[PDB]
Ligand binder design. Structure first.
Ligand SMILES: [Mg+2]
Ligand SMILES: [Mg+2]
Ligand SMILES: [Mg+2]
Ligand SMILES: [Mg+2]
Ligand SMILES: [Mg+2]
Ligand SMILES: [Mg+2]
Ligand SMILES: [Mg+2]
Ligand SMILES: [Mg+2]
Ligand SMILES: [Mg+2]
Lengths: 224, 87, 213, 13, 52
RNA sequence: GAUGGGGAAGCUCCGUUUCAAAGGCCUGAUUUUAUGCAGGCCACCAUCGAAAGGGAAUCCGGUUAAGAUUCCGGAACCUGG
RNA sequence: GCUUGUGACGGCCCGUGAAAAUCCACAGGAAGGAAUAGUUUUCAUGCCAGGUCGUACUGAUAACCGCAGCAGGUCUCCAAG
RNA sequence: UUGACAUUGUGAAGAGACAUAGUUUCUUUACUUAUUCAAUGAAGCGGAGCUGGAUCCACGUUCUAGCAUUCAAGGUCCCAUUCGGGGCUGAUCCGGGUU
């Protein structure tokens, strides 16, 4: 095509106007976005005491999937089907219910009475003091527990938006073996595997540029 | 009376482009097209395209501003919003 | 006691600067990528008088590196700079009168003007007419530059700090006698209300500490 | 006919 | 100037109105000569790189 | 001289674009997931402050007890559509 | 000749002697536009409209201020032999 | 103007006490996350390229009062060619720091 020619643009300094580029790194974000990002960065940068840093160790993907598979079979009664049962109770005048136990006070009381077969504790609870004592309480009472990612996931378990805790107290005879196997799996995967590393402090992580400076200084010290 | 500004009266107020109509209705383009089909709103040709579109000769779809203002009161628009909330 | 003028001047009031006829604040360009890494060429469009300032000013037009338009800067004119001259600003600019360069990019004995105290503050030192700064030396390890100021002081500045090659034009202004209270009047009319001055001795004991006798 | 509210329709095509 | 035709406000040339004839002539000469010198500089730089 | 903010026990004070998610416009059969808005562009701060500064465009003749470049007659001009 | 407006100049400054609204022009070319038919409302003519408030009179040895119809004070234009 | 206490955090080295396993003080030297100053159009920062040429540089800009703007022309791969439309590149990659 003789009518089309190649006319390259010089994007150097003092040359043609710079093209549009991705300036996402330099965006002046809204104050709330900046606050949440810098808050997470500060949580990473500061040294974290062990009783808070223990919540960064959670179940693996497969074990969490199996746990939620077991709990979804005991998801509690909704508002619509409670109406159905009460209509049946009105005419008859119901079997024993099996349901996931939830509510912070209720589950803490069940742990103190040694009735919870398994306790799930959400990791992203704010304020964290609401569950910061729960692993130690479960250990002292001998209650099997697991820290899981997602209070929203626990909320979907108990028909809520969020849920700081979930508890399996009584299970059916067609799921008792699954519950026992899950307890042993959690003991091997979360209790014994993370028993020592939860006694350490966390969050001694440098920023990107500070880490690069430290590495360059160490290299210049070791060789010239 | 002070001097009046140009591009405000006549063709410039009589006709509204499709982008401006969609923005005023605060709906999507597909919902706007379906509303116009249901209500029988049809594109129009001004006798002076430059006067209607600020001197630009670029091809644009034009509507009647009063037709779009009448389309603002159609309850099917509220039904569309209800369906979106349900979805 | 009664408040003296030395204390009355702090409130502002009738003591503010007379800024109606000023051309604008005389500053260097904002230190950007072009001046940090390469250079940028601007053109001297005119050389103008600034009311209340001895030194003349130069209007220098650059091209915006990120948008199609022109950018206007107000420099203090160094002696020998003329209209239509090409000014070069950046780390890679040549050693010529009127060019803006970092203090680390110039050799020892270089005469500069409109020198930054900190890099990017757009000119702080040697701005009055006939004044200049001498590059005494360099400390590359700390990236510092030793300079001599018009008052004879020796200062240590960051080498990233910039300056204009040459000496501020309009020198020799103070060599001419005013001869006249009227010429002093017209001088301070464009600056501020600090003229005429009444001696504190001529004042009353309430008026001034030097008053009375 | 007359509007009692700020937002009215009144149905004139 | 809004009340008159375009003939009263222009002359029939590039930059008619805004710039006068001698300034237009000077910028035409300058554009042509500088573009030719740019071609010369590019050829010289490429030859110097090849011979280096 | 408000707002965003920040002081002050407080009536209120600072400051005037900052320290703010401060608002407009273009294209779309967005390769269709089947009734849910996608892709882009440009960016700066209210309001008040002059009947001597800036500023669209009108003249002559006649007329009243008292009006007059305003009314009457004739002749123009500007702005917007 | 007087007054006044304007032009081209000359002198003076360590004094070099407002801003904004608004209007026009250029550069550029997203585009649109004809053959038995288009284009151009920066050429002429033709059509329609222009709201609110002020408008009398004195402006001073009697209409303002000085307790007054007070020899005081109070900004400016035109100006004949 | 001077001193103390609080705001106030993290390491390494040299010195201490349980009578030669790590529980806390004194100095020395670093660090950044608090706090502080300044600027911007929060535009090009930091690090690395089997990137290139010779540890250093971009070899993309220095006779001249010109010009530089419409997802960038071009290269290449598709479409179903139709007035054109997509992707990679042109314009290296990575970052949990606007400078
Ligand atoms: Mg005396
Ligand atoms: Mg105030
Ligand atoms: Mg006003
Ligand atoms: Mg006036
Ligand atoms: Mg009269
Ligand atoms: Mg009349
Ligand atoms: Mg009158
Ligand atoms: Mg009186
Ligand atoms: Mg009185």
């Amino acid at each position: 095509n003789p009518l089309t020619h190649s006319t390259p643009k010089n994007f150097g300094i003092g040359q043609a106007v710079q093209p549009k580029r991705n300036l996402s790194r330099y965006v002046k974000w809204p104050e709330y976005v900046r606050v949440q990002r810098q808050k997470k960065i500060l949580s990473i940068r500061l040294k974290v005491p062990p009783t808070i840093a223990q919540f960064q160790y959670t179940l693996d993907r497969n074990t969490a999937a199996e746990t939620f598979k077991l709990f979804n079979k005991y998801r509690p009664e909704t508002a619509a089907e409670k109406k159905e049962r009460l209509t049946k109770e009105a005419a008859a005048v119901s079997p024993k219910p099996y349901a996931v136990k939830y509510g912070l006070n209720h589950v803490v009381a069940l742990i103190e009475n040694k009735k919870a077969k398994l306790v799930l504790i959400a990791n992203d609870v704010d304020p964290i003091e609401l569950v910061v004592f729960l692993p130690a309480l479960c250990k002292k009472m001998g209650v099997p527990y697991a820290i899981v990612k997602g209070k929203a996931r626990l909320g979907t378990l108990v028909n809520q938006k969020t849920s700081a805790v979930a508890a399996l107290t009584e299970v059916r005879a067609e799921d008792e073996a699954a519950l026992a196997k899950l307890v042993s799996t959690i003991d091997a995967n979360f209790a014994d595997k993370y028993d020592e590393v939860k006694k350490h402090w966390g969050g001694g992580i440098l920023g990107n540029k500070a880490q690069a400076k430290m590495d360059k200084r160490a290299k210049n010290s070791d060789s010239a | 009376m002070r001097i009046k500004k140009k591009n405000t009266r006549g063709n410039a107020r009589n006709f509204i482009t499709r982008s401006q109509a969609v923005r005023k209705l605060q709906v999507s383009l597909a919902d706007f097209r379906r509303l116009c089909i249901f209500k029988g709103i049809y594109p129009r040709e001004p006798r002076n395209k430059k006067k209607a579109n600020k001197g630009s000769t670029a091809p644009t779809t034009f509507y009647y501003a009063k037709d779009i203002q009448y389309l603002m009161h159609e309850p099917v628009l509220a039904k569309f919003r209800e369906h979106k909330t349900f979805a | 006691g009664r408040v003296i003028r030395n204390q009355r001047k702090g409130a502002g009031s009738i003591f503010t600067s007379h800024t109606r006829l000023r051309q604008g604040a005389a500053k260097l360009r904002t230190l950007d990528y072009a001046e940090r890494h390469g250079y940028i060429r601007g053109i001297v469009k005119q050389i103008v008088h600034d009311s209340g300032r001895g030194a003349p000013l130069a209007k220098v037009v650059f091209r915006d590196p990120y948008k199609y338009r022109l950018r206007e800067e107000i420099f203090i004119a160094n002696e020998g700079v003329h209209t239509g001259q090409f000014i070069y600003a950046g780390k890679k600019a040549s050693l010529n009168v009127g060019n803006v360069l970092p203090l680390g990019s110039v050799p020892e004995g270089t005469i500069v003007s409109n020198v930054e105290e900190k890099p990017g503050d757009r000119g702080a030192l040697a701005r009055a007419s006939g004044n200049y700064v001498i590059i005494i030396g360099h400390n590359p390890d700390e990236n510092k530059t030793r300079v001599r100021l018009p008052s004879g002081a020796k200062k240590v500045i960051s080498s990233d700090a910039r300056g204009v090659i040459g000496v501020i034009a309009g020198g020799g202004r103070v060599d001419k006698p005013l001869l006249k209270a009227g010429r002093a009047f017209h001088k301070y009319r464009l600056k501020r209300n600090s003229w005429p001055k009444t001696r504190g001795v001529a004042m009353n004991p309430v008026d001034h500490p030097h008053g009375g006798g | 006919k007359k509007s009692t509210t700020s937002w009215s329709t009144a149905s004139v095509r | 100037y809004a009340t008159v035709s375009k003939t009263h406000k222009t002359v029939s040339r590039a930059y008619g109105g805004s710039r006068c004839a001698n300034c237009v002539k000077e910028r035409i000469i300058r554009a042509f000569l500088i573009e030719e010198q740019k071609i010369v500089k590019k050829v010289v730089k490429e030859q110097t790189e090849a011979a280096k």
